[PDB]
């Protein structure tokens, strides 16, 4: 159950709640108070999805789908059969994600490392909550949230997007995609670079970080360095998700028309608005 080097780190302490009550492992897994909390919320959510599926009349995971309450309920409670289950499940999921984060904080404290991981995780948690809590509440109904099902949730993405024309035209959505794409570029390169140095041409000595910096300066004229690239990845990642949340928080709230039409602000600026020719005159 332990890695060869692990015993020295398995000391008491670091818990936020409960003292030494839950300060133990199960196999490789740290538990803690929040270990117990996440189990409780996950078990309860799964039971409730199971129940949803009996009411639906299918056990096929490609068809199971827990829907939010219809718009007619607004921000009220709804009957279990018609949206209440989705509401309770959402509470449980939120409880399980937040508990998972706090458990990582316990683990950080015991290992004496920084808190960057759970902090980053909170960005994902915040994107989730944008879609199922913040946007719906500003829009005035739980019905604007996405349903829990494999294919139904894509249906939602597609119907939601096409409500506003071609969603490509949401300008925050453009920024977000840029970061997503750039993050994947950066991850390919980082992985490639380190491995290209640890694993040089056959017969040669392992390369050094200097070879890494040289390689990039030769290639593109700059190298951000080894601390810089981990800072970069963290930032590209989190920015991606930040701009994702933002492109949705503004959709249906401050802006509810077709996104393509938003760009008329630019083209109708008075300096060029009526100058003939081009595409727009």
């Amino acid at each position: 159950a332990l890695l060869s080097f692990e015993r020295k780190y398995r000391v008491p302490g670091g818990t936020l709640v409960g003292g030494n009550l839950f300060d133990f492992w199960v196999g490789p897994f740290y538990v803690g108070f929040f270990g117990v909390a996440t189990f409780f919320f996950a078990a309860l959510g799964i039971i409730l999805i199971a129940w949803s599926a009996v009411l639906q009349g299918t056990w096929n995971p490609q068809l199971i789908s827990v829907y939010p309450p219809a718009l007619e309920y607004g921000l009220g409670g709804a009957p279990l059969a018609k949206g209440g289950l989705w509401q309770i499940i959402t509470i449980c999921a939120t409880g399980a994600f937040v508990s998972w984060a706090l458990r990582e904080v316990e683990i950080c404290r015991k290992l004496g490392i920084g808190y960057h991981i759970p902090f980053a995780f909170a960005f994902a948690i915040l994107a989730y909550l944008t879609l199922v809590l913040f946007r719906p509440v500003m829009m005035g109904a739980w019905g604007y949230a996405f349903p829990y099902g494999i294919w139904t949730h894509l249906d939602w993405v597609s119907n939601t997007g096409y409500t506003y024309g071609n969603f490509h035209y949401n300008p925050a959505h453009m920024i977000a995609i840029s970061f997503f794409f750039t993050n994947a570029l950066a991850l390919a390169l980082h992985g490639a670079l380190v491995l290209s140095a640890a694993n040089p041409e056959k017969g040669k000595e392992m390369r050094t970080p200097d070879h890494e910096d040289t390689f990039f300066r030769d290639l593109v004229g700059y190298s951000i360095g080894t601390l810089g690239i981990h800072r970069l990845g963290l930032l590209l990642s989190l920015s991606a998700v930040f701009f994702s949340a933002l492109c949705m928080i503004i959709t249906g709230t401050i802006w509810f028309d077709q996104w393509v039409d938003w760009w008329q602000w630019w083209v109708k600026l008075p300096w060029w608005a009526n100058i003939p020719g081009g595409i727009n005159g």
Binding site: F180, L189, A192, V194, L195, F215, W266, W272
Partner: protein, 302 residues
């Protein structure tokens, strides 16, 4: 509070670093550029030197010809005036030839011919850049991981504008050069093929794209968390595991039940990313050549 290590608190600067030599032809390295303080808060301050061989100058010459070929077309569409040019920047497009001309190179400048010229220039710009990626690594005796990862990205690009157009028998099927026009194309591609959300390859692509954000978020956060034990010094931690590597593994083992090594995580990294364009390119390649409608395909699977 405690320091987070997102920005440096102090910058330190020494003599410019001319780099490792190994088998590089030093006659083709530039001078060093200036030092950026701005950049130095986040990573290195040093700009330069850069390497310019035959393959670099070729890439860069063609790349510029591609860009200017497009811009000539845009300036033209803008009746040659700079207000209209800025006003409609996003709406101008260089479209490929009409289906009528199929794969012929006989289409006129104003109706396809320019698209081809530009595409030709882009083709050599990229492939030459690819070779330079390989040769720069060889000159320093490193692995070819970067050239191979870059190839994955070239795969999708090549499928989009070259292979799939050849396999469908017309250039009209390729992507136009424009900001809004290439978004329209993308949305249109999906509609025409019965909704790309039923393309299983498209869905895997998504998973690796999201997965790449997940992993780089995990990996960077981890390395910053153990940078107080010199975690960023990844090659020496490979050669000689330290407490940084140990705690990084253990955080994750205790969290989710398993873990990586300092070398191993980078294999996870390179593959997660590479598989985005790898699966994507297959998804697009099969669209219209073999499957007309992914909904329909999804109903049978055959």
């Amino acid at each position: 509070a405690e320091y987070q290590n997102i920005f440096s608190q102090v910058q330190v600067r020494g003599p410019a670093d001319l780099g490792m030599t190994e088998d590089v032809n030093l006659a083709n390295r530039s001078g060093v550029g200036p030092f950026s303080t701005l950049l130095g808060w986040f990573g290195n301050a040093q700009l330069g030197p850069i390497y310019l061989g035959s393959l670099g100058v070729l890439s860069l010459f063609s790349g510029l010809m591609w860009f200017f070929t497009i811009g000539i077309w845009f300036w033209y569409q803008a009746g040659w005036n700079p207000a209209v040019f800025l006003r409609d920047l996003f709406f101008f497009s260089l479209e490929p030839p009409a289906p009528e001309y199929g794969l012929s190179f006989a289409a006129p400048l104003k109706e396809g011919g320019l698209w081809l010229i530009a595409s030709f220039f882009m083709f050599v710009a990229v492939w030459s850049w690819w070779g330079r990626t390989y040769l720069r690594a060889q000159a320093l005796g490193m692995g070819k991981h970067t050239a191979w990862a870059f190839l994955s990205a070239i795969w999708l690009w090549m499928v989009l504008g070259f292979i799939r157009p050849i396999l469908m028998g017309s250039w009209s099927e390729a992507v136009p050069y424009g900001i809004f026009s290439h978004l329209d194309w993308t949305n249109n591609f999906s509609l025409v093929h019965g909704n790309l959300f039923y393309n299983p390859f498209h869905g895997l692509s998504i998973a690796f794209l999201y997965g790449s954000a997940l992993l780089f978020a995990m990996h960077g956060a981890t390395i910053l968390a153990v940078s107080r034990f010199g975690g960023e010094r990844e090659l020496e931690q490979i050669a000689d595991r330290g407490t940084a590597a140990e705690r990084a593994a253990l955080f994750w083992r205790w969290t989710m039940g398993f873990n990586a090594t300092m070398e191993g995580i980078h294999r996870w990294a390179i593959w997660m990313a590479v598989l985005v364009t790898l699966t994507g390119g297959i998804g697009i390649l099969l669209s219209g050549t073999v499957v007309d409608n992914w909904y329909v395909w999804g109903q049978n699977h055959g």
